[PDB]
Symmetry: C3
Subunit: 159 residues, 3 copies
């Protein structure tokens, strides 16, 4: 079978005055991620991994910060559109795995919520979607709570 | 043909007065990795990739870091238990790849032994396990030798 | 059948007096990447993902004195084939605050596809800034990440 792998990366700054939205989940916190709309670092990484697996460029090439069509779209809408494009390219999604690196707050309570959102948007069984969380052991801008990173891996198959 | 992919990340601080244990190998060195377990950054990354590929969460979910057994835990025993759970979930491991990023010490003399340990723990032949090493080209906290990072990828198949 | 995955990481410092070469594309810029070779961070990450997927070690284990990174990528492909593997696809991300990489990405894909003897639609290259965070965000270096899938025939 015609399997393909994709990989994704994203990072945003963490500062007072924005809400924290990760994997479609709003998470209580003094601070939030700085970005164009919701700055959903996990959904962006996943979107990138899916475009990558399909060899369709990247998230910024499909959904520009300038495009009127996506001006007020949230990252779940973008993820859904991504999934439609991957489908039309001939690919079925097999699984997604991911890691959020955040020194704080605790993400574990929210993991099943994120998985549920992602599986819904990709039309995948829940057991094909995984999200993991790591601290940076107090190293670097991640370790000082200055930003949050997401990594993603996706496997697809041409059908 | 039900393939799944997983990815993992880990980093630990490098501090005096600790054994340096990476990939299960005790490496002569004046500093070691800081953590509650033996802090084996490579094995944790691989363990997370395997749980990720099976959609079984992450290492914190499976091995509570406040269990007395976690203190000084042999990360190879953790990796073997991870493999047991992944098998119990119905998955067979096809391959593992990984990268260690460290300014020092020189890892090359130890890499084959790490490979052999991981292959043993996962009941894989050597030719399905790979460990790569990198410096960070003098950049950042890794370039300053403040910690060591590992990255891992795993492919599994649900039987 | 007998599929394998690999993953690769590279980073190089940005320094004056060097051309900036990424994915085989020379990009106008005041600085370039520092390395023994031409320091093509993207090609190095893909090279390591390919050796990793074939369980052949890493780029430092294999590597030529004045060779550029495309010759090394071609040699990597040769060694991957020698071990009995065929390449199925490559995906990657370049993390650079500057310069703008958009105009150059399709050319990088074409270069990699030619070097790996792959059709264009099995090769992908993505780009990201680091949101002004860390050494990447300060423009002190450029990182690349890669993933490769191969099959043992
Ligand atoms: N140094 C960089 C970094 C990113 N990019 C492109 O910008 C869009 C948003 O990340 C993406 O489409 C990405 O390709 C770029 O052209 N140059
Ligand atoms: N921001 C974070 C970071 C980590 N975690 C969980 O804590 C375990 C060890 O860091 C991790 O393995 C993960 O289980 C979390 O819930 N939220
Ligand atoms: N701390 C490190 C980092 C890297 N290396 C080896 O040097 C070569 C160049 O990355 C690679 O072959 C790598 O294995 C090492 O021996 N120890
Ligand atoms: O059961 C796996 C295991 C093997 C060896 C040592 C500790 C454990 C832990 C159990 C819970 C936290 S660590
Ligand atoms: Cl270094
Ligand atoms: K990183
Ligand atoms: Zn983003
Ligand atoms: Zn660890
Ligand atoms: Zn390099």
């Amino acid at each position: 079978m015609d399997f393909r792998i994709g990989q994704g990366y994203d990072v945003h700054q963490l500062v007072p005055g924005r809400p924290l939205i990760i994997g479609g989940v709003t998470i209580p916190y003094e601070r939030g991620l700085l970005g164009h709309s919701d700055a959903d670092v996990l959904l962006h990484a996943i979107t990138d991994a899916l475009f990558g697996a399909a060899a369709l460029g990247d998230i910024g090439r499909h959904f520009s910060d300038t495009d009127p069509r996506f001006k007020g779209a949230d990252s779940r809408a973008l993820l859904r559109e991504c999934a439609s494009r991957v489908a039309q390219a001939g690919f079925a999604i097999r699984n997604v795995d991911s890691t959020i690196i955040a020194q704080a707050p605790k993400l574990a309570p929210h993991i099943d919520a994120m998985r549920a959102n992602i599986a819904a948007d990709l039309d995948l069984p829940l057991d094909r979607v995984n999200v993991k969380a790591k601290t940076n052991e107090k190293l670097g801008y991640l370790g000082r709570g200055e930003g949050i990173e997401a990594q993603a891996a996706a496997l697809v198959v041409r059908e």
